[PDB]
Amino acid sequence: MRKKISIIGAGFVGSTTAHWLAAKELGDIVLLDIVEGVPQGKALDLYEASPIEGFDVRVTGTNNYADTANSDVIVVTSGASREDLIKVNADITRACISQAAPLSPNAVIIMVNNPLDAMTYLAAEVSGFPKERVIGQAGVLDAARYRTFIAMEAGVSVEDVQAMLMGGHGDEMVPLPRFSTISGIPVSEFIAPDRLAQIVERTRKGGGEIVNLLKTGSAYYAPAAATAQMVEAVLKDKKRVMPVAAYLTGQYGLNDIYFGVPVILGAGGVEKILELPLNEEEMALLNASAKAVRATLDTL
Template sequence: MRRAKISIIGAGNVGATCAHWCAAAELGDIVLLDIPATEDMPAGKALDLRQASPIMGFDSSVIGTTSYDDTAGSDVIVVTAGIPRKPGMSRDDLLATNAKIVTSVGEQIKATSPDAVVIVVSNPLDAMVQQMWKVTGFDSAKVCGQAGVLDTARYRTFLAMELGVSVEDISALLMGGHGDTMVPIPSCTSVGGIPITQLIDPARLEEIVERTRKGGAEIVSLLKTGSAYYAPAAACAQMVEAVVKDKKRCIPVAALCHDEYNVGGYYVGVPAIMGTGGVEKIIELSLTESETADFQNSVDAVKSLVATMDELLANG
């Protein structure tokens, strides 16, 4: 059997670190691509990573390129391309520029890898994955967004820090848009099977949720120049693994919802089963009245963001 072909579009911090995680786990052969203006930068990062293989003991091929021809026939494509957030910027500030970048990338993917599963990471996430699906025309199961894995990881990290327990024992779920309107689901959050509500009082739990919502901005403010990349890249690698190994992982994914949760044709974060086919099944939960209201508020924010994006693109 041939190895899976994994292409990563965008060789910045998130893309290069995603390549690192995927190579180290031997998930497949990797193509790291960036725009021609970067010249030999992707090739340099790829060669450096490949030279780590004898030390770390992995045999994945890693190449860097500025040509989409090298990505042809990819099984999975991770799209990190776009400008990053700077201090004081919201994800929404990135909308106009990154929508144009994602449009260009989507056109290239459609031409070179029509059977790929596409995982979008570019921000603002929910609008970018909606645009990717629109541009490629792929089955919606083959186009999804990475946000929920990252948001849930941040949530689990903060809960572990609060309780002094292993992150491995914490199960959690966040739904909705990627940003300040994300929705925690307390009934799906536990520590070693113990409901989180029995371990942390509601007021403190809400403070942890709020820190999770602003998790990316907190890192941006600390770094001063740049945004998070270790955890976002690891989250991407987990989704790549679910596809190439047909893991059937039940994870939060930005997936296209129609009748599900009465969303009506938008990408939002929901629990889903991921395997070789991409988003193979969306899981519908019975939400409480307050969770339903919060989720609808988050969906409305996504709809507004998409409408703004469509208007910006239509006006050039």
Template sequence: MRRAKISIIGAGNVGSTTAHWCAAAELGDIVLVDIPGDFADMPRGKALDLMQASPVMGYDSSITGTNDYADTAGSDVVVVTAGIPRKPGMSRDDLLGTNAKIMGSVCEQIKATSPDAIVIVVSNPLDAMVQRAHQVTGFPAQRVLGQAGVLDTARYRTFLAMELGVSVEDVSALLMGGHGDTMVPLASCTSVGGIPVSQLIKADRLEEIIDRTRKGGAEIVGLLKTGSAYYAPAAATAQMVEAIVRDKKRLIPCAAYCDKEYGVGGFYVGVPVVLGSAGVERIVELELTDSEQAGFQKSVDAVQELVEVMAGLV
């Protein structure tokens, strides 16, 4: 039986750390891709460094660095981290337009070289970029999805565990909506060791933790000064890769294409899904409280606005 083939487009911090987590878990053979230019050898250097770690860490994954999409041919999973971060003086529309063009170029290559792949988009603005990936590849919606919910849930669980002084393993949580300030952590689906979080944390304090979760990425950017988070985003992406290549049937939040689910008509937004070897195998519809529904609708409206702006730019 052959190993799964996992290609990661973008060999920056998130892409190379995703390769690290995937290799350490022996999820498959990995191809790390970046563009030619002044740093053309960078993906090969990172791949070689990861290969040299394998005797110490005990993994047998093959890791290849390249500038050539031909090396990705026949991938089972393609992770897209390519894109530019927002820079001082750059408007949201500038970022959206530039990254939409990059995503379009990347996805044309994916379509040509790995027509049967499942695509996980990590690039920002996430909800618009996964919509773009779906449009350009033309793949069935279940095979194109976005990573954000796993990361945001991990941040939420971390802050709850820190607050209560308990193991992160005992904190179970779920959130929905777009990736950013409008995400909707669901208190009704949050528990610690099976105990509803409302019995352990007062409502006003829980709201403070939720607010910190929404701003989790910005908090790290502020601390790092240059760059943004990559350990947790990469770990979250690797968990999604594992769910697919090992057919785990994980029930986790992802940016998935909704066609009437939750009343959303024809675009991507963060919802709970069952993730397995076919990609998004089904969307799980929950009964939301009135406040959760209102928050989710606000998030959906923000995502729809972003998608409409992108359509005008590309």
């Protein structure tokens, strides 16, 4: 039987994720939302594109969690002062997870809702799922923006640029230029220190840069691509090495917390958390980031 992917929240990120996934013909897709008509319409529209692109994937829209039963992967993209933001997203996340988790006990849950690290922590607590199967998408998106800026500046193919980073988005991000390369060569060999610093800065503010341009909306093409790549990693058991929000039990000196770290991602979800040897400067950035993430967790 085909793999089954359920996407909770048929907004810009959710429907765009469905688009990236359908074209890959990875499995059947279920788009769920609380708003009537929206998920059914977007699903049917995407589905009607199948004869043109040539993919045989069933794309259905629904308002009933019963249709997400026995999903292999669950993608949560239903999220919406700072304390109010947390409360609002916590209620939505709790509601989404408590109704979906029980119907797909063997599924891997991929959270996209912000505040990312906190919501992923909540999703694990509410689902009761083994920690390795509840992860958050954040690092892959930030790393993609970073890689795009590098390829653009260096004048090289985006396929030959790799990068690893940690933490969350914005101020919570932990950039690691030392761990970025172009075909195995340090990026510091292609880009001067000052320009590289500008690129790191642009990466931290990357999400806001899109917001300031759209005025009334946030990014969705890259966030969905990032989310889709993680879904593919699990379904095809590719063992991708990427930065994802995972539950830590001592790594980097952090415990009882979800934090963006390097992992091997496969069919079993987080199969391994890599512990990189960070220098003094890098640890300073990680500690500052960990602090902010911890604060958000405490508020939650």
